[PDB]
Design a protein around this motif. Structure first.
Motif, PDB file in Angstrom:
ATOM      1  N   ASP A 274       0.801  -1.225   0.000  1.00 50.10           N
ATOM      2  CA  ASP A 274       0.000   0.000   0.000  1.00 50.10           C
ATOM      3  C   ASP A 274       0.840   1.284   0.000  1.00 50.10           C
ATOM      4  N   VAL A 275       1.970   1.221   0.691  1.00 43.96           N
ATOM      5  CA  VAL A 275       2.956   2.280   0.851  1.00 43.96           C
ATOM      6  C   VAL A 275       3.650   2.651  -0.482  1.00 43.96           C
ATOM      7  N   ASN A 276       3.730   1.698  -1.438  1.00 46.01           N
ATOM      8  CA  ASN A 276       4.361   1.907  -2.746  1.00 46.01           C
ATOM      9  C   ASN A 276       3.370   2.014  -3.898  1.00 46.01           C
ATOM     10  N   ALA A 281      -3.633   4.671 -10.337  1.00 43.52           N
ATOM     11  CA  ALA A 281      -3.716   3.413 -11.072  1.00 43.52           C
ATOM     12  C   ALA A 281      -4.139   2.197 -10.221  1.00 43.52           C
ATOM     13  N   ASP A 282      -3.709   2.137  -8.934  1.00 37.41           N
ATOM     14  CA  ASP A 282      -3.887   0.988  -8.037  1.00 37.41           C
ATOM     15  C   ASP A 282      -4.897   1.201  -6.917  1.00 37.41           C
ATOM     16  N   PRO A 283      -5.953   0.351  -6.815  1.00 41.86           N
ATOM     17  CA  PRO A 283      -6.912   0.531  -5.712  1.00 41.86           C
ATOM     18  C   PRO A 283      -6.367  -0.032  -4.392  1.00 41.86           C
ATOM     19  N   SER A 284      -6.724   0.598  -3.270  1.00 41.15           N
ATOM     20  CA  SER A 284      -6.306   0.099  -1.955  1.00 41.15           C
ATOM     21  C   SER A 284      -7.219  -1.094  -1.582  1.00 41.15           C
ATOM     22  N   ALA A 321       5.109  -4.788   6.579  1.00 51.57           N
ATOM     23  CA  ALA A 321       4.191  -5.696   7.258  1.00 51.57           C
ATOM     24  C   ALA A 321       3.153  -4.928   8.096  1.00 51.57           C
ATOM     25  N   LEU A 322       3.604  -3.945   8.909  1.00 49.09           N
ATOM     26  CA  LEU A 322       2.724  -3.154   9.770  1.00 49.09           C
ATOM     27  C   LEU A 322       1.812  -2.174   9.040  1.00 49.09           C
ATOM     28  N   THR A 323       2.305  -1.510   7.961  1.00 52.55           N
ATOM     29  CA  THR A 323       1.470  -0.615   7.142  1.00 52.55           C
ATOM     30  C   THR A 323       0.385  -1.402   6.393  1.00 52.55           C
ATOM     31  N   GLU A 324       0.661  -2.683   5.976  1.00 54.49           N
ATOM     32  CA  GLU A 324      -0.357  -3.567   5.354  1.00 54.49           C
ATOM     33  C   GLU A 324      -1.437  -3.923   6.390  1.00 54.49           C
ATOM     34  N   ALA A 325      -1.015  -4.168   7.635  1.00 52.98           N
ATOM     35  CA  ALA A 325      -1.921  -4.498   8.739  1.00 52.98           C
ATOM     36  C   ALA A 325      -2.806  -3.326   9.116  1.00 52.98           C
TER      37      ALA A 325
END
Ligand SMILES: [Mg+2]
Ligand SMILES: [Mg+2]
Ligand SMILES: [Mg+2]
Ligand SMILES: [Mg+2]
Lengths: 408, 407
Positions: A274-276, A281-284, A321-325
């Motif tokens: 999500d951070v990159n 173009a890319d949905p969260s 890992a934590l930003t994905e969580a």
């Protein structure tokens, strides 16, 4: 300084006592079923995510609640596979998605099947709660940040003795001759899936088909050797189907009345952290969850939705890992806003555990809210998740649930 | 296991678990008795490894075999942080689960307004335990541990100190003694009436040079006090019917004696031996001490409060010592389940903090509950919630107006 006063802690405990006293079980069946799966999101990952989310919002960290910390019901889940104390994502998927424990590296097959032995599949297939929700007339969806052919989402529709058989190019010729089908083929043919959102474009297209976003890179191109275009074959199954590969296409498709079935494949393989991600173009994960809920909620019979925060363990520098969580927690909050607790059973779990001033196989937490969420208690076997969801939805083998329907 | 290869086996196992969950009803009365079982460093990984070992010891594969705690109907996650530290210690956490207020690292029974090692910061900052409030309400009270009775966790039930290491007056600076501060061993006998005290810590109770009854030839095991006080003789003289024991034979005899109404058992100079190394004739197990405490405490018609610590689980953590201590801790829970009725007894199982193949620190821990008001143990809670649930269920201060029907 407020924390130095015993009155502050006594008031905080009186508040928690008041939420517990007001807590009443919802005794109806559930119209909608939602399972949020955090990949490798055991008890330590949940703690570290709470700290980070708190700190991001200007707090010290551990005192601040995540969206999951507000779920009324909690249980511990025993994750072991039939043949391994330390499990993998494939074996666990069979337990929380099909309701039977299985062997390491196999999907949607009982422990009578054997890893990499193609003939052992037949007569040993087990059917997911999603498959049974479809059979009962509900709309079904799968949302993930990994490829849609990965072990966890594949658990909702596939039967394979080998989790690595993403496309026909991954399979030995002996397995193909024996009648075995790759995961990408099973996604379009095993059952009718109304909403499919995630990565995995390359496994759907013939060898050499350039990727729409990476046409100059051969590593991103189609890999199939059977000349099949699986996207075109899925689109032709029914009227009202739509294929999208970017955010702009996804947003219009979500509001389009002619779109009743949607396939969104946003990357050749895994979706970006999500951070990159390119915000245009890319949905969260939260955006894909909202689109899936809006499309699935139109069915008066209800829906089953599987949501995977699939790159939490893959990132585990820790920051990825934590930003994905944190994004996974915001997808839970988004779904909580679009659904009513009176008719929707939402479960949050992990498939397996990840292996100062203010090594695998461990049990994981299960969080639940909604009708029959009070059945989520104590220490349970992981396969219990699939049975509580089938029971709450009055799906096979619990058609005889004896539950009153929810209002509306 | 061939049975495990059949989907019918897993489907039947889950159908059985569904029936149990549907039959599960909350007990809406107050609790007469309150029991808190604390596993030292017994986080989620330790519970999992204990289940495997207990299973294997009884001739099973391991993960499928339930522990006595796995049968508790209610579960919650507990956030363990101290006011000043994300990674907590046993002293700060004890104040939270025993007194109901979060506190600073290395302090016991004082609010976070107090400061570590600053004697003057104690006064006006003391917080009172659920045990203390249970005694004020007329209940009988007990402390059972495998560590010294002056250790941080058991000390949380009776003591107020700005320094967890002040076991005896020999551990304290003279400036702290002059300021009015009392060592933990002194607070054990004087702060409140404790009916049952079982564990280790003989040396902190006796004057310097008093030989230990079991190791008289070892100077390291002798009394350490410098104030000439014999704290055991003072505790015994508080009331009629008191008894002091130091071995298993004396404990079993005291247990069968109707004239014994208060009991102090100190089985080692410091920590009790690992269950695996204990002399079965001289040393009582944690399950034996629990049975003796329950039998003595249950005579009071007002009820009782009992604190049980499996205190050497983290200390052992080769892993074999840690896990065998956790197995004995699980058998002490089963023993208490046999001697008490869930219709009038609230039992809680938790850990103070987390510990730091073929078939860090500061992490949340599990809370297990059974009995009246155990259904209030749910979700994700702050660790100090444990003390408030117990005070609420027992209709103890500050919840005398609980509004609950009696059991
Ligand atoms: Mg996964
Ligand atoms: Mg893209
Ligand atoms: Mg301790
Ligand atoms: Mg001894």
């Amino acid at each position: 300084v407020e924390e130095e006063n015993p009155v502050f802690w006594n008031q905080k405990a009186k508040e928690a006592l008041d939420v517990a006293k007001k807590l009443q079980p919802i005794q109806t069946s559930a119209k909608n079923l939602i399972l949020f799966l955090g990949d490798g999101m055991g008890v330590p990952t949940v703690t570290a995510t709470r700290i980070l989310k708190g700190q991001l919002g200007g707090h010290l960290g551990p005192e601040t609640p995540l969206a999951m910390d507000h779920f009324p019901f909690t249980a511990l889940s025993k994750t072991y596979n039939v043949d391994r104390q330390v499990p993998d994502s494939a074996g666990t998927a069979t337990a929380y998605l099909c309701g039977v424990k299985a062997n390491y590296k196999t999907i949607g097959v009982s422990a009578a099947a054997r890893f990499n032995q193609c003939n052992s599949t037949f007569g040993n297939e087990v059917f997911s709660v999603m498959h049974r929700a479809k059979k009962a007339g509900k709309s079904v969806g799968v949302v993930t940040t990994t490829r849609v052919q990965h072990a966890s989402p594949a658990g909702t529709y596939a039967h394979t003795v080998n989790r690595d058989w993403y496309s026909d190019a991954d399979m030995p010729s002996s397995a193909l001759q024996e009648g075995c089908k790759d995961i990408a083929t099973q996604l379009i043919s095993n059952m009718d899936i109304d909403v499919i959102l995630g990565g995995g474009r390359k496994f759907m297209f013939p060898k050499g088909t350039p990727d729409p976003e990476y046409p100059g890179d051969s590593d991103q191109s189609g890999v199939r050797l059977d000349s099949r275009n699986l996207v075109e074959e899925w689109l032709a199954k029914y009227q009202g189907t739509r294929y999208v590969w970017n955010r702009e296409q996804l947003m219009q498709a979500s509001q389009d009345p002619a779109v009743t079935r949607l396939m969104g494949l946003f990357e050749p393989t895994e979706m970006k952290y999500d951070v990159n991600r390119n915000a245009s173009a890319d949905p969260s994960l939260a955006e894909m969850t909202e689109v899936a809920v809006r499309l699935l909620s139109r069915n008066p019979q209800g829906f089953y939705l599987f949501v995977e925060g699939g790159r939490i363990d893959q990132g585990h520098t820790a920051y990825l890992a934590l930003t994905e969580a944190v994004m996974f927690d915001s997808a839970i909050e988004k779904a909580s806003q679009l659904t009513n607790e009176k008719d929707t059973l939402t479960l949050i779990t992990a498939d397996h555990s990840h292996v100062t001033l203010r090594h695998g196989g461990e049990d994981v937490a299960i969080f639940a809210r909604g009708p029959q969420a009070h059945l989520v208690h104590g220490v349970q076997e992981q396969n219990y998740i699939a049975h509580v969801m089938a029971f709450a939805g009055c799906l096979e083998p619990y058609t005889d649930c004896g539950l009153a329907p929810p209002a509306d």
